[PDB]
Amino acid sequence: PFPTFGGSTGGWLRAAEVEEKYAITWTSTKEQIFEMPTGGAAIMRNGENLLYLARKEQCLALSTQLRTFKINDYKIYRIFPSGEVQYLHPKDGVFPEKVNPGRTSVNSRGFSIGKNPNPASIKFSGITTYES
Amino acid sequence: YASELDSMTGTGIESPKVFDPLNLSDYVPVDWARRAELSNGRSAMLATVGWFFPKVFGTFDSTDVTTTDPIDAIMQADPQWWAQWILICGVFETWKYKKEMEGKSFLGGADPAVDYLKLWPADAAAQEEMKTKELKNARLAMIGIAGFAANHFIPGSCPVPDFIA
Amino acid sequence: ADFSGEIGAANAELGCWDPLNFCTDQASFDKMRYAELKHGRVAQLAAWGYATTWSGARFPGCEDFPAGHEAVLKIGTENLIPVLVVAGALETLWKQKEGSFPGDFSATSFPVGFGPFAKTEADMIDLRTKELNNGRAAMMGILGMIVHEQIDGKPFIFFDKFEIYAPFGN
Amino acid sequence: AASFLPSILVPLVGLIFPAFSMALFFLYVQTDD
Amino acid sequence: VDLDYGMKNSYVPATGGDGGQGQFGAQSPNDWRVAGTSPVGETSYAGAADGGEEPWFAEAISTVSLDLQKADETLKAFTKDAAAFKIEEFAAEKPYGFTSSDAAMEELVGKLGYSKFLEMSTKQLMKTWGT
Amino acid sequence: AWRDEVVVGITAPVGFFDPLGLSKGKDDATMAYYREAELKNGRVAMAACLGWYLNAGGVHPAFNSELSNDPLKAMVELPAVGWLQFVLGCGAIEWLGQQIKERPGYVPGDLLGASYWVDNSDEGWVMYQNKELNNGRLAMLAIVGMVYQDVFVGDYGDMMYKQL
Amino acid sequence: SVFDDAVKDWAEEYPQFAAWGWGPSVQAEIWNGRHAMFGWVVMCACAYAKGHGLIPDADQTLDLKEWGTLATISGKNTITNERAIILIANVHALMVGLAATISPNSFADTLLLDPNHPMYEWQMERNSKLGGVMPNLGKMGVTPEAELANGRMAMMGIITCIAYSGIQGQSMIDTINEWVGGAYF
Amino acid sequence: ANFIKPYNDDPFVGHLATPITSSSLTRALLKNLPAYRFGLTPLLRGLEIGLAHGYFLIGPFAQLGPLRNSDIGLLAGFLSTIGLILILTLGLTIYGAAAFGQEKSNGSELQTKKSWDQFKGGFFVGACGSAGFAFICLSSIPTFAL
Amino acid sequence: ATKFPKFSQALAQDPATRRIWYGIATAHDLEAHDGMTEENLYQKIFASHFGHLAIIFLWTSGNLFHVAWQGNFE
Numbered sequence A: 001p002f003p004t005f006g007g008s009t010g011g012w013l014r015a016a017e018v019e020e021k022y023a024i025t026w027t028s029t030k031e032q033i034f035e036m037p038t039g040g041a042a043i044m045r046n047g048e049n050l051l052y053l054a055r056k057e058q059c060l061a062l063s064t065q066l067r068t069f070k071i072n073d074y075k076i077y078r079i080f081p082s083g084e085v086q087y088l089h090p091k092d093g094v095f096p097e098k099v100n101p102g103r104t105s106v107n108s109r110g111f112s113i114g115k116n117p118n119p120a121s122i123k124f125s126g127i128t129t130y131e132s
Numbered sequence B: 001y002a003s004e005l006d007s008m009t010g011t012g013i014e015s016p017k018v019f020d021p022l023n024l025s026d027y028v029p030v031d032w033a034r035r036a037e038l039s040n041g042r043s044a045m046l047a048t049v050g051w052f053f054p055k056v057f058g059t060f061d062s063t064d065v066t067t068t069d070p071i072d073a074i075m076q077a078d079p080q081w082w083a084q085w086i087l088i089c090g091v092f093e094t095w096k097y098k099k100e101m102e103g104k105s106f107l108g109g110a111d112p113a114v115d116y117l118k119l120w121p122a123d124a125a126a127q128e129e130m131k132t133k134e135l136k137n138a139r140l141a142m143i144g145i146a147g148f149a150a151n152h153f154i155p156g157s158c159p160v161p162d163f164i165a
Numbered sequence C: 001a002d003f004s005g006e007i008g009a010a011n012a013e014l015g016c017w018d019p020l021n022f023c024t025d026q027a028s029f030d031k032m033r034y035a036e037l038k039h040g041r042v043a044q045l046a047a048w049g050y051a052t053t054w055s056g057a058r059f060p061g062c063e064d065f066p067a068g069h070e071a072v073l074k075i076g077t078e079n080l081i082p083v084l085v086v087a088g089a090l091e092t093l094w095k096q097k098e099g100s101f102p103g104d105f106s107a108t109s110f111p112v113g114f115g116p117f118a119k120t121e122a123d124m125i126d127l128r129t130k131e132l133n134n135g136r137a138a139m140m141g142i143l144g145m146i147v148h149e150q151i152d153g154k155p156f157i158f159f160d161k162f163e164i165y166a167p168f169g170n
Numbered sequence D: 001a002a003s004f005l006p007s008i009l010v011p012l013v014g015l016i017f018p019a020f021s022m023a024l025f026f027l028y029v030q031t032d033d
Numbered sequence E: 001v002d003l004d005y006g007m008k009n010s011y012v013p014a015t016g017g018d019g020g021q022g023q024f025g026a027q028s029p030n031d032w033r034v035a036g037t038s039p040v041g042e043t044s045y046a047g048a049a050d051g052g053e054e055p056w057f058a059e060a061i062s063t064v065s066l067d068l069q070k071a072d073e074t075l076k077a078f079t080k081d082a083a084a085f086k087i088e089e090f091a092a093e094k095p096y097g098f099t100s101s102d103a104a105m106e107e108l109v110g111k112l113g114y115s116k117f118l119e120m121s122t123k124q125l126m127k128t129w130g131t
Numbered sequence F: 001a002w003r004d005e006v007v008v009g010i011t012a013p014v015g016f017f018d019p020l021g022l023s024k025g026k027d028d029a030t031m032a033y034y035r036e037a038e039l040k041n042g043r044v045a046m047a048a049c050l051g052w053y054l055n056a057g058g059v060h061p062a063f064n065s066e067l068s069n070d071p072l073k074a075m076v077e078l079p080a081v082g083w084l085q086f087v088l089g090c091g092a093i094e095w096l097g098q099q100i101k102e103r104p105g106y107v108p109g110d111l112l113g114a115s116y117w118v119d120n121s122d123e124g125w126v127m128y129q130n131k132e133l134n135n136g137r138l139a140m141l142a143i144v145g146m147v148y149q150d151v152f153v154g155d156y157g158d159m160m161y162k163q164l
Numbered sequence G: 001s002v003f004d005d006a007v008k009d010w011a012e013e014y015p016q017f018a019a020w021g022w023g024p025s026v027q028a029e030i031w032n033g034r035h036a037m038f039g040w041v042v043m044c045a046c047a048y049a050k051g052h053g054l055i056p057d058a059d060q061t062l063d064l065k066e067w068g069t070l071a072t073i074s075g076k077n078t079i080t081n082e083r084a085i086i087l088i089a090n091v092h093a094l095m096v097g098l099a100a101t102i103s104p105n106s107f108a109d110t111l112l113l114d115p116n117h118p119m120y121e122w123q124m125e126r127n128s129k130l131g132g133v134m135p136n137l138g139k140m141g142v143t144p145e146a147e148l149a150n151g152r153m154a155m156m157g158i159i160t161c162i163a164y165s166g167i168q169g170q171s172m173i174d175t176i177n178e179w180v181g182g183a184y185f
Numbered sequence H: 001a002n003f004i005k006p007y008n009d010d011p012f013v014g015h016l017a018t019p020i021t022s023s024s025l026t027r028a029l030l031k032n033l034p035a036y037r038f039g040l041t042p043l044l045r046g047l048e049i050g051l052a053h054g055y056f057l058i059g060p061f062a063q064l065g066p067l068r069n070s071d072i073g074l075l076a077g078f079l080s081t082i083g084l085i086l087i088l089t090l091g092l093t094i095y096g097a098a099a100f101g102q103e104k105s106n107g108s109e110l111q112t113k114k115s116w117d118q119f120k121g122g123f124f125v126g127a128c129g130s131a132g133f134a135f136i137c138l139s140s141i142p143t144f145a146l
Numbered sequence I: 001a002t003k004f005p006k007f008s009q010a011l012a013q014d015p016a017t018r019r020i021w022y023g024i025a026t027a028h029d030l031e032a033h034d035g036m037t038e039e040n041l042y043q044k045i046f047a048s049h050f051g052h053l054a055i056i057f058l059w060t061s062g063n064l065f066h067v068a069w070q071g072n073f074e
């Protein structure tokens, strides 16, 4: 289900084969030309499409472009060398910009930025003021 | 001495049993030793002849080397000869490698690596006897070339015929 | 038909290099093979002879004769006739062994054959191939020499004559 | 003679020493204790 | 699917100045520091791809890929808890002739697929499951 | 059968050209040898032609332009060391070529391995290949003609278009 | 004083080097000893040559033009031929040593103990049973034991020669000649 | 006709199959080079590589060095080459230690500690010997004149 | 840590060349090293000072030595 592309010297390298790799998938209603983050132009297929990239940002950048084409069914995965796959985005099925009941707060401090502790107070502690 | 020596060619009439008084077999691997024994021996066999051949039977028609003394000619000879000599030896060494990899043997094996005269016996009995003769002649030659050199530098060290000098 | 199996094939791919399709059947091939061998053997001796003479060596009683084709033209025919007589006799003597490769004269009166030289079949094939190949080379060689002799007088192209190193012969 | 020391030490201090030191640092920083 | 495969890495968070393993782990379990190319007929990076007659470009031979079928499974596994929360709330709001959470899930996902199910409010779900 | 498959080399002026029928009974291997020889002999000829032309013209800016403008005289003047390098270098390439030939899928004459990207189905490819062959065939005859002129007629320059 | 403790402490303080056999180890004792034994020959040879005037054109300095500033001791002053020749002899030897260190055989005693060398086990074993204060007789002849004993002897001699030379205020070459009976000179 | 295609038919890998990258010539040359050739042992691989690199290195030093015009120029050139070989050998040793570690198992894989050590040794012998060969050759240069 | 910057896990676990660069330039900021107590800090600083003093004296010794052995003071 690979989109039609002729190849580039800006594709993935060894890290994709020995450390980690990424993959995005989407469905289209027409064959159209899009610009790939790696560099160049490609033609998507009329239906399912799969593409591999080396960075999550590269994948999410393409998603932005896809939204312009009115495609909002994209999914991003991380494939480890052993074959293990992790579903990353949309994580809970709902885009992050939309509040979804069932999501808990993380890394939240209940005070204004100016209420953090003084650096000297936490000296020889190992923690930082913003983590204190 | 190493046990394998008991099952190898080399012991004969003048040496009924394994000769390794200092048990060098303990240190040097048995295989490497035989390979080296033959290599140094075969080369020595050729040297002995070369030590006197130019003197006794004459020299080629050239003036690069004027002396006949075996040692002196080494420096008189043009360097180009020496370079080509190293090259030919390298070629020989390569041949032994490639042919050995083809299953052939240059150490008394079943399939000869170099038998241009086609005189390698088929029967194992004769083969064994043939190998023994080569080893002997080789050992004798090594001793001889050493002797020649000795008398050359330290006169009287060895009983060498005058012509051989 | 397929003479690739025959000794002397150019190589595994080309098989028998017969550009003009002289050979058609085994019968013809045998004819051609016999001829090639004969010419080859004759040539091998010829090159040896030409070189020996051109370089200067002469038999007792032949110290004033010239060398090369010039000899054939100048030397007395009477002293050349012996060659024909000694060759014609051989022509009659050599006897081809039936059911054997062309050029096998094992059936000759005097003992002739692989004798002690060859043991295995492979050894025989090798010696045979070498005889043929060396003959092929000489055939070209003797021509090359004669031609150049006529062209410039230098039968060896790069040097006038050979110098031999025969220690024992001295 | 001490006079020969300049010609015996300088070659060592400026060439041998720096080399070995750099090698050791590389081996030290490329090792994962 | 081992949902902790990524978390199970050699990374050890430091005291101060580190966000941590986050949600999906901070580093790949595997070490990128593998060797270079090897002679024909040999392998280097463990489960590497044989370069055949071009060992020099072996690293360009892909061996890591995503199976579309397998892709479905990873989607379901990593979003299992979310689905659970969703159906639970639907159950809490007095479902019409409710049966079993799982049963309801199957019915509700039989229609509206699965992705659509994950993106629907309990209200919409109840409307959908009115029947 | 080579005759039933060959496409390159057959052009318009004469079509298939074998008046003496030197390829009637030859097998594919022999025919392959012939095509390879044809191309090699031709390609070398083309190069030789260019070399002769440049030297004759006087554009031989090497060795302080010491060597003669006559191409055949110059060869004699060239030191042997120069010739040895030439033969040995070409010999090296010949060895590599043999390796390529052994590899499966070898198309007689292809050392760049263009078979990997293009086949004879493409007309553009076959046409361009034909141009190499045709020019090579002509060059072969030309180099033979020029040598005659230089060795017998006595000239090593154009005696055809020189008269404006 | 127990020797063993000191060695252990060194290993602890400098573990990385100790792993390869560097420092106060049997390996070092063997190798350094071998070199000292060999040197004695070199030093005696130098003495003989000096006394018998064998070295060609000694007491003369190499040309600063043929050779370079590398041959200068101070300013334009250059090294004498004798010292140069002695050095070249040593360089011949050092080259052999470098080859042996960088390109060891499969049945050779490597300078450092490498787990990936086939002789590692034998070397480890030999070293494990070669330690003592007194030479172990009964293992005379060509044995590892004899080698170590002779090596220690040679190394001690070097120390003694230097000391005696200083006490008597003489060159080491002179002391050598003296201990031989004045034969060389 | 397109002479440039995606490498290994993977449109997303960062490489392309150009005539330079994948031609019979390039493939043949690289396959038979000592580094990638099939069958060569680690030692032999190093030896061939060393023999090749040592022969061409004596030139630069001998003809352009500080003592080029001296009668002992060639000798000096040889010594300089040996010095460079030693530096390169140190590098090889250090690289192996860091890249491969301390104990190995696979064996006969240029990419292991034991194999690398053997490779390094071969390089040293070949390089130094090759330089010596050049010394002998450059001592007397043939004019190839009849 | 198990890498070059033993005093910093953060730098030690870095997959780039920064690990080496920063480790060298953050070596003498003993106060920020992982697991540093005030007592240890003072003790290490005191010892480091002894080393600096030694370097200063070695430097002075060299000047005297070289002037005496290769100079023209007299």
Ligand code: CLA
Pocket (backbone or CB within 6 Å): D010, D011, D013, D014, D015, D016, D019, D020, G068, G069, G070, H065, H066, H067, H076, H079, H080, H082, H083, H084, H086, H087, H090
């Ligand atoms: C204190 C340090 C130091 C010393 C002692 C030298 C010494 C020398 N340099 Mg130098 N150099 C240095 C630092 C140093 N350099 C630095 C830092 C640079 C970088 C800018 C250079 C760049 C440089 C260049 C570009 C050149 C030199 C050259 C030379 C040589 C010229 C004299 C001569 O006779 O040449 C003639 C050479 C000889 C007689 C050969 C001498 C034998 C060699 C040196 C043996 C080396 C083996 C050595 C042990 C291997 C090292 C192993 C490793 C573990 C350290 C001389 C040996 C020239 C030369 O010829 O290099 C050899 C030259 O072209 N140098």
Ligand code: CLA
Pocket (backbone or CB within 6 Å): F006, F008, F009, F010, F011, F014, F015, F016, F017, F018, F022, F023, F031, F034, F035, F037, F038, F041, F042, F137, F138, F140, F141, F144
């Ligand atoms: C190296 C020489 C050489 C070789 C090997 C070939 C080989 C081939 N040519 Mg060819 N050709 C050549 C030169 C050569 N050509 C030249 C110079 C011309 C220009 C006139 C042509 C023009 C030509 C045409 C127009 C056609 C061919 C074709 C062919 C192929 C089929 C015909 C055949 O089997 O010929 C067999 C030929 C040989 C086995 C070798 C040639 C015979 C040698 C050269 C004998 C020398 C004769 C000659 C008169 C020598 C004197 C030259 C000069 C002194 C006057 C075959 C692969 C046909 C083709 O491509 O079909 C696929 C085709 O249509 N050729």
Ligand code: CLA
Pocket (backbone or CB within 6 Å): H057, H060, H061, H064, H065, H066, H067
């Ligand atoms: C970068 C420019 C440059 C160049 C070309 C030179 C050139 C030279 N310097 Mg110099 N030098 C330079 C910068 C340069 N210098 C700088 C910046 C300094 C200040 C530090 C010096 C300081 C210096 C000193 C102190 C000395 C020299 C010396 C020398 C000479 C000795 C050459 C030598 O041993 O190299 C050895 C070279 C090599 C071992 C390798 C050369 C590179 C190879 C040939 C590249 C091959 C690439 C290949 C073609 C790729 C394709 C391969 C494929 C076909 C298979 C030479 C004339 C010495 C001398 O006598 O002066 C005349 C000397 O004593 N230099």
Ligand SMILES: CC1=C(C#C/C(C)=C/C=C/C(C)=C/C=C/C=C(C)/C=C/C=C(C)/C=C/[C@@]23O[C@]2(C)C[C@@H](O)CC3(C)C)C(C)(C)C[C@H](O)C1
Pocket (backbone or CB within 6 Å): G001, G003, G006, G032, G035, G036, G037, G038, G039, G040, G042, G043, G090, G155, G158, G159
């Ligand atoms: C203080 C202390 C202790 C101690 C101690 C003691 C006594 C320590 C003393 C150690 C001592 C004194 C060790 C001598 C070494 C001499 C060597 C290595 C000579 C090498 C010589 C070599 C390598 C020879 C080289 C040459 O051949 C070459 C290279 C070139 C030739 O031209 C010339 C020569 C021949 C020169 C205790 C009590 C034991 C334990 C306690 O806990 C700590």
Ligand SMILES: CC1=C(C#C/C(C)=C/C=C/C(C)=C/C=C/C=C(C)/C=C/C=C(C)/C=C/C2=C(C)C[C@@H](O)CC2(C)C)C(C)(C)C[C@H](O)C1
Pocket (backbone or CB within 6 Å): B080, B081, B083, B084, B087, C011, F088, F090, F091, F092, F094, F095, F098, H137, H138, H140, H141, H142
């Ligand atoms: C001593 C010395 C010097 C020297 C020197 C010396 C000896 C130098 C030696 C140089 C030498 C041997 C160079 C050798 C060159 C050989 C070549 C190209 C061979 C090509 C083979 C090919 C294509 C094979 C093709 C095939 C055919 C068709 C049939 C098929 O079936 C199979 C197959 C077999 C594959 C110098 C020159 C370095 C100068 C210095 O100063 C002094």
Ligand SMILES: CC1=C(/C=C/C(C)=C/C=C/C(C)=C/C=C/C=C(C)/C=C/C=C(C)/C=C/C2=C(C)CCCC2(C)C)C(C)(C)CCC1
Pocket (backbone or CB within 6 Å): B086, B087, B090, F089, F092, H051, H052, H053, H055, H056, H125, H126, H128, H129, H130, H132, H133
């Ligand atoms: C441009 C080009 C090319 C290339 C060229 C080149 C790059 C060359 C190089 C070359 C080289 C670079 C060569 C080398 C050589 C080397 C040698 C030849 C060596 C030898 C050695 C020896 C022989 C031995 C030694 C030794 C040893 C081993 C040790 C002991 C001692 C002795 C001495 C024995 C060609 C033409 C292909 C084609 C076109 C392109």
